[PDB]
Amino acid sequence: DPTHFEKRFLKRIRDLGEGHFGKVELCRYDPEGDNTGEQVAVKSLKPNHIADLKKEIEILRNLYHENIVKYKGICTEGIKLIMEFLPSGSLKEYLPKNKNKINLKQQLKYAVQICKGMDYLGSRQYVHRDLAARNVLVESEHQVKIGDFGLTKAIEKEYYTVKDDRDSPVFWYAPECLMQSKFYIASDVWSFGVTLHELLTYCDSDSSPMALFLKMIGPTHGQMTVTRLVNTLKEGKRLPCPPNCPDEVYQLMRKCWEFQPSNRTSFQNLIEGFEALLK
Numbered sequence: 001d002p003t004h005f006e007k008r009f010l011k012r013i014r015d016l017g018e019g020h021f022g023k024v025e026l027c028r029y030d031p032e033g034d035n036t037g038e039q040v041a042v043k044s045l046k047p048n049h050i051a052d053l054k055k056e057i058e059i060l061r062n063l064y065h066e067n068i069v070k071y072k073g074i075c076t077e078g079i080k081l082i083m084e085f086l087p088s089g090s091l092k093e094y095l096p097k098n099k100n101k102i103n104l105k106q107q108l109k110y111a112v113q114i115c116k117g118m119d120y121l122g123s124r125q126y127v128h129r130d131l132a133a134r135n136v137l138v139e140s141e142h143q144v145k146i147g148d149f150g151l152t153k154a155i156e157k158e159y160y161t162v163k164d165d166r167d168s169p170v171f172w173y174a175p176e177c178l179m180q181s182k183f184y185i186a187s188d189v190w191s192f193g194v195t196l197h198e199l200l201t202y203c204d205s206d207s208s209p210m211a212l213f214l215k216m217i218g219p220t221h222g223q224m225t226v227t228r229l230v231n232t233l234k235e236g237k238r239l240p241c242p243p244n245c246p247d248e249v250y251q252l253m254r255k256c257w258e259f260q261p262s263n264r265t266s267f268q269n270l271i272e273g274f275e276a277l278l279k
Protein backbone atom coordinates (compact mmCIF):
# COMPACT_ATOMS: atom_id res chain seq x y z
CA ASP A 1 0.00 0.00 0.00
CA PRO A 2 1.68 3.30 -1.15
CA THR A 3 -0.64 5.26 1.20
CA HIS A 4 0.79 3.36 4.22
CA PHE A 5 3.95 4.97 5.68
CA GLU A 6 6.14 3.23 8.28
CA LYS A 7 7.21 5.44 11.23
CA ARG A 8 10.84 4.04 11.13
CA PHE A 9 11.52 5.55 7.63
CA LEU A 10 9.78 8.97 8.41
CA LYS A 11 12.78 11.25 9.14
CA ARG A 12 11.96 14.58 10.72
CA ILE A 13 13.83 17.52 9.08
CA ARG A 14 12.18 20.52 10.80
CA ASP A 15 8.96 22.08 12.17
CA LEU A 16 6.73 23.85 9.54
CA GLY A 17 3.78 25.05 11.57
CA GLU A 18 1.93 24.68 14.85
CA GLY A 19 -1.66 25.05 16.06
CA HIS A 20 -2.97 24.46 19.58
CA PHE A 21 -3.50 20.65 19.16
CA GLY A 22 -1.99 20.02 15.72
CA LYS A 23 1.58 20.20 14.42
CA VAL A 24 3.00 20.10 10.86
CA GLU A 25 6.59 18.97 10.23
CA LEU A 26 8.82 18.47 7.20
CA CYS A 27 9.93 14.82 7.02
CA ARG A 28 11.69 12.69 4.39
CA TYR A 29 10.14 9.25 3.84
CA ASP A 30 13.45 7.39 3.48
CA PRO A 31 13.13 3.54 3.14
CA GLU A 32 16.65 3.30 1.56
CA GLY A 33 18.39 5.17 4.44
CA ASP A 34 20.67 7.16 2.06
CA ASN A 35 18.58 10.42 2.44
CA THR A 36 17.17 10.22 -1.12
CA GLY A 37 13.47 9.70 -0.21
CA GLU A 38 10.70 12.16 -1.04
CA GLN A 39 10.03 15.09 1.29
CA VAL A 40 6.53 15.05 2.86
CA ALA A 41 4.53 17.33 5.19
CA VAL A 42 3.45 15.37 8.31
CA LYS A 43 0.52 16.37 10.59
CA SER A 44 0.60 14.94 14.13
CA LEU A 45 -1.25 15.82 17.33
CA LYS A 46 0.77 17.23 20.26
CA PRO A 47 0.75 14.92 23.37
CA ASN A 48 -7.48 13.63 23.20
CA HIS A 49 -8.20 14.89 19.60
CA ILE A 50 -7.31 11.54 17.87
CA ALA A 51 -10.98 11.15 16.74
CA ASP A 52 -11.10 14.55 14.93
CA LEU A 53 -7.75 13.92 13.13
CA LYS A 54 -8.97 10.49 11.94
CA LYS A 55 -12.13 12.19 10.56
CA GLU A 56 -9.94 14.98 8.95
CA ILE A 57 -7.67 12.27 7.37
CA GLU A 58 -10.81 10.72 5.83
CA ILE A 59 -12.15 14.08 4.55
CA LEU A 60 -8.79 14.93 2.88
CA ARG A 61 -8.34 11.39 1.46
CA ASN A 62 -11.52 11.82 -0.64
CA LEU A 63 -10.81 15.42 -1.73
CA TYR A 64 -9.24 15.62 -5.19
CA HIS A 65 -8.65 19.19 -6.46
CA GLU A 66 -5.67 21.23 -7.75
CA ASN A 67 -6.53 23.96 -5.18
CA ILE A 68 -6.54 21.50 -2.26
CA VAL A 69 -3.28 19.99 -0.72
CA LYS A 70 -2.84 16.36 -1.90
CA TYR A 71 -3.37 13.59 0.68
CA LYS A 72 -0.38 11.15 0.45
CA GLY A 73 -1.22 8.68 3.23
CA ILE A 74 -1.09 7.75 6.91
CA CYS A 75 1.32 6.55 9.59
CA THR A 76 -0.19 4.36 12.40
CA GLU A 77 0.92 2.37 15.56
CA GLY A 78 -2.18 6.68 17.18
CA ILE A 79 -2.17 8.23 13.65
CA LYS A 80 -0.16 10.86 11.54
CA LEU A 81 -1.45 12.52 8.30
CA ILE A 82 0.92 12.31 5.32
CA MET A 83 0.58 15.01 2.66
CA GLU A 84 2.69 16.51 -0.17
CA PHE A 85 5.20 19.17 0.92
CA LEU A 86 4.70 22.80 -0.33
CA PRO A 87 8.03 24.57 0.40
CA SER A 88 6.78 28.20 0.12
CA GLY A 89 4.68 27.68 3.31
CA SER A 90 1.44 29.54 4.09
CA LEU A 91 0.22 32.92 2.62
CA LYS A 92 0.54 34.31 6.17
CA GLU A 93 4.34 33.64 5.97
CA TYR A 94 4.91 33.98 2.21
CA LEU A 95 3.14 37.28 1.34
CA PRO A 96 5.17 39.67 3.68
CA LYS A 97 8.49 38.41 2.20
CA ASN A 98 7.27 38.50 -1.44
CA LYS A 99 5.62 41.93 -1.96
CA ASN A 100 7.95 42.62 -4.95
CA LYS A 101 6.96 39.22 -6.48
CA ILE A 102 3.13 39.30 -5.90
CA ASN A 103 1.08 42.09 -7.51
CA LEU A 104 -2.72 42.74 -7.64
CA LYS A 105 -3.31 40.58 -10.73
CA GLN A 106 -1.52 37.70 -8.92
CA GLN A 107 -3.47 38.43 -5.63
CA LEU A 108 -6.78 38.17 -7.57
CA LYS A 109 -5.66 34.95 -9.25
CA TYR A 110 -4.93 33.49 -5.78
CA ALA A 111 -8.42 34.78 -4.76
CA VAL A 112 -9.99 32.66 -7.64
CA GLN A 113 -7.95 29.54 -6.71
CA ILE A 114 -8.99 29.77 -3.04
CA CYS A 115 -12.64 30.27 -4.27
CA LYS A 116 -12.43 27.24 -6.62
CA GLY A 117 -10.97 24.98 -3.89
CA MET A 118 -13.59 26.21 -1.40
CA ASP A 119 -16.42 25.69 -3.98
CA TYR A 120 -15.27 22.05 -4.50
CA LEU A 121 -15.31 21.47 -0.68
CA GLY A 122 -18.90 22.87 -0.36
CA SER A 123 -20.12 20.77 -3.34
CA ARG A 124 -18.88 17.72 -1.39
CA GLN A 125 -21.16 18.91 1.53
CA TYR A 126 -18.43 20.26 3.82
CA VAL A 127 -17.94 23.32 5.96
CA HIS A 128 -14.39 24.44 6.53
CA ARG A 129 -14.90 26.72 9.64
CA ASP A 130 -11.18 27.87 9.65
CA LEU A 131 -10.71 29.73 6.33
CA ALA A 132 -7.77 32.17 6.87
CA ALA A 133 -4.45 32.91 5.05
CA ARG A 134 -2.56 30.78 7.66
CA ASN A 135 -4.46 27.73 6.24
CA VAL A 136 -3.70 28.59 2.60
CA LEU A 137 -0.48 27.03 1.22
CA VAL A 138 1.79 28.46 -1.52
CA GLU A 139 2.67 25.92 -4.30
CA SER A 140 4.53 28.53 -6.36
CA GLU A 141 4.23 32.24 -7.32
CA HIS A 142 1.18 31.22 -9.46
CA GLN A 143 -0.69 28.59 -7.41
CA VAL A 144 -2.27 28.38 -3.92
CA LYS A 145 -4.00 25.40 -2.23
CA ILE A 146 -6.19 24.97 0.91
CA GLY A 147 -3.67 23.35 3.26
CA ASP A 148 -5.60 22.56 6.41
CA PHE A 149 -8.89 20.83 7.30
CA GLY A 150 -8.74 20.47 11.12
CA LEU A 151 -12.16 22.08 11.71
CA THR A 152 -13.88 20.69 8.56
CA LYS A 153 -17.35 19.12 9.21
CA ALA A 154 -20.07 17.52 6.98
CA ILE A 155 -23.39 19.45 6.53
CA GLU A 156 -26.35 16.97 6.65
CA LYS A 157 -29.85 20.84 6.14
CA GLU A 158 -28.20 24.19 5.31
CA TYR A 159 -25.74 23.89 8.25
CA TYR A 160 -23.93 21.90 11.02
CA THR A 161 -24.15 23.03 14.71
CA VAL A 162 -20.82 23.07 16.58
CA LYS A 163 -20.58 21.94 20.22
CA ASP A 164 -16.89 22.83 20.89
CA ASP A 165 -16.17 26.53 19.96
CA ARG A 166 -12.89 26.85 21.94
CA ASP A 167 -10.21 27.44 19.22
CA SER A 168 -12.53 29.44 16.91
CA PRO A 169 -10.93 32.28 14.80
CA VAL A 170 -13.66 34.76 15.93
CA PHE A 171 -12.32 37.70 13.81
CA TRP A 172 -12.96 35.52 10.69
CA TYR A 173 -16.50 34.23 11.72
CA ALA A 174 -19.88 35.26 10.37
CA PRO A 175 -22.44 36.66 12.88
CA GLU A 176 -24.48 33.36 12.84
CA CYS A 177 -21.32 31.41 13.90
CA LEU A 178 -20.69 33.93 16.68
CA MET A 179 -24.35 34.08 17.85
CA GLN A 180 -25.56 30.46 17.44
CA SER A 181 -22.41 28.38 16.40
CA LYS A 182 -24.34 27.76 13.07
CA PHE A 183 -22.04 26.89 10.13
CA TYR A 184 -23.36 27.25 6.60
CA ILE A 185 -21.40 27.27 3.28
CA ALA A 186 -22.17 31.07 3.45
CA SER A 187 -20.15 31.14 6.74
CA ASP A 188 -17.13 29.99 4.61
CA VAL A 189 -18.03 32.78 2.15
CA TRP A 190 -17.88 35.30 5.05
CA SER A 191 -14.45 33.86 6.12
CA PHE A 192 -13.27 34.09 2.50
CA GLY A 193 -13.84 37.88 2.56
CA VAL A 194 -11.63 38.09 5.66
CA THR A 195 -8.96 35.85 3.94
CA LEU A 196 -9.30 38.20 0.88
CA HIS A 197 -8.52 41.25 3.12
CA GLU A 198 -5.36 39.54 4.52
CA LEU A 199 -4.22 38.63 0.96
CA LEU A 200 -4.66 42.31 -0.32
CA THR A 201 -2.74 43.50 2.83
CA TYR A 202 0.05 40.90 2.16
CA CYS A 203 -0.88 39.42 5.59
CA ASP A 204 0.50 42.47 7.52
CA SER A 205 0.57 41.96 11.34
CA ASP A 206 -0.32 45.60 12.25
CA SER A 207 -3.36 45.54 9.93
CA SER A 208 -4.45 41.92 10.64
CA PRO A 209 -8.26 41.32 10.85
CA MET A 210 -7.93 40.87 14.66
CA ALA A 211 -6.06 44.22 15.07
CA LEU A 212 -8.33 46.12 12.63
CA PHE A 213 -11.38 44.98 14.65
CA LEU A 214 -9.79 45.70 18.12
CA LYS A 215 -9.23 49.31 16.97
CA MET A 216 -12.91 49.39 15.77
CA ILE A 217 -14.56 47.87 18.93
CA GLY A 218 -12.06 48.82 21.68
CA PRO A 219 -9.22 46.60 22.94
CA THR A 220 -10.18 46.54 26.71
CA HIS A 221 -13.42 44.53 26.72
CA GLY A 222 -11.91 41.15 27.81
CA GLN A 223 -14.60 38.44 27.60
CA MET A 224 -17.11 41.02 26.19
CA THR A 225 -15.15 41.25 22.92
CA VAL A 226 -17.24 38.74 20.90
CA THR A 227 -20.53 40.44 22.01
CA ARG A 228 -19.13 43.87 20.99
CA LEU A 229 -17.74 42.31 17.75
CA VAL A 230 -21.37 41.12 17.08
CA ASN A 231 -22.55 44.67 18.13
CA THR A 232 -20.42 46.37 15.48
CA LEU A 233 -21.29 43.76 12.74
CA LYS A 234 -25.01 44.44 13.56
CA GLU A 235 -24.50 48.26 13.24
CA GLY A 236 -23.25 47.71 9.67
CA LYS A 237 -19.49 48.23 10.37
CA ARG A 238 -16.97 46.12 8.38
CA LEU A 239 -13.16 45.79 7.87
CA PRO A 240 -11.75 48.91 6.04
CA CYS A 241 -10.55 48.95 2.39
CA PRO A 242 -6.96 47.64 2.09
CA PRO A 243 -4.42 50.30 0.98
CA ASN A 244 -3.93 50.35 -2.83
CA CYS A 245 -7.02 48.02 -3.26
CA PRO A 246 -9.49 49.18 -5.99
CA ASP A 247 -13.06 49.83 -4.80
CA GLU A 248 -14.51 47.07 -7.12
CA VAL A 249 -12.30 44.38 -5.48
CA TYR A 250 -13.41 45.87 -2.10
CA GLN A 251 -17.09 45.63 -3.37
CA LEU A 252 -16.68 41.86 -4.05
CA MET A 253 -15.34 41.57 -0.45
CA ARG A 254 -18.30 43.62 0.97
CA LYS A 255 -20.64 41.03 -0.67
CA CYS A 256 -19.03 38.25 1.48
CA TRP A 257 -20.08 40.25 4.57
CA GLU A 258 -23.84 40.66 4.05
CA PHE A 259 -25.14 40.07 7.63
CA GLN A 260 -27.75 37.51 6.42
CA PRO A 261 -26.21 34.18 5.15
CA SER A 262 -28.67 34.29 2.13
CA ASN A 263 -27.77 37.87 1.02
CA ARG A 264 -24.07 36.75 0.59
CA THR A 265 -22.62 35.76 -2.83
CA SER A 266 -21.66 32.11 -3.56
CA PHE A 267 -18.10 30.99 -4.43
CA GLN A 268 -19.18 30.37 -8.13
CA ASN A 269 -20.35 33.99 -8.23
CA LEU A 270 -17.13 35.31 -6.63
CA ILE A 271 -15.17 33.33 -9.31
CA GLU A 272 -17.18 35.13 -12.06
CA GLY A 273 -16.56 38.40 -10.19
CA PHE A 274 -12.74 38.17 -10.10
CA GLU A 275 -12.65 36.72 -13.72
CA ALA A 276 -14.34 39.91 -15.08
CA LEU A 277 -11.62 41.97 -13.30
CA LEU A 278 -8.81 39.77 -14.79
CA LYS A 279 -9.80 40.02 -18.55
Ligand SMILES: O=C(Nc1cn[nH]c1-c1cc(Cl)ccc1OC(F)F)c1cnn2cccnc12
Residues within 6 Å of the ligand: 016, 017, 018, 019, 022, 023, 024, 041, 069, 083, 084, 085, 086, 087, 088, 089, 090, 091, 093, 133, 134, 135, 136, 137, 146, 147, 148
Ligand atom coordinates in the same frame (compact mmCIF):
# COMPACT_ATOMS: atom_id res chain seq x y z
O1 LIG B 1 4.40 25.05 5.51
C1 LIG B 1 3.51 24.23 5.74
N1 LIG B 1 2.64 24.33 6.79
C2 LIG B 1 2.60 25.43 7.68
C3 LIG B 1 3.43 26.59 7.74
N2 LIG B 1 3.02 27.27 8.81
N3 LIG B 1 1.98 26.67 9.44
C4 LIG B 1 1.69 25.56 8.76
C5 LIG B 1 0.55 24.68 9.12
C6 LIG B 1 0.47 24.21 10.43
C7 LIG B 1 -0.60 23.41 10.80
CL1 LIG B 1 -0.73 22.90 12.45
C8 LIG B 1 -1.57 23.04 9.90
C9 LIG B 1 -1.50 23.50 8.60
C10 LIG B 1 -0.45 24.32 8.21
O2 LIG B 1 -0.32 24.79 6.92
C11 LIG B 1 -1.29 25.59 6.44
F1 LIG B 1 -0.74 26.70 5.99
F2 LIG B 1 -2.20 24.95 5.70
C12 LIG B 1 3.28 23.07 4.83
C13 LIG B 1 3.94 22.76 3.63
N4 LIG B 1 3.35 21.77 2.96
N5 LIG B 1 2.28 21.41 3.75
C14 LIG B 1 1.31 20.48 3.45
C15 LIG B 1 0.31 20.31 4.34
C16 LIG B 1 0.33 21.07 5.55
N6 LIG B 1 1.26 21.96 5.85
C17 LIG B 1 2.24 22.14 4.91
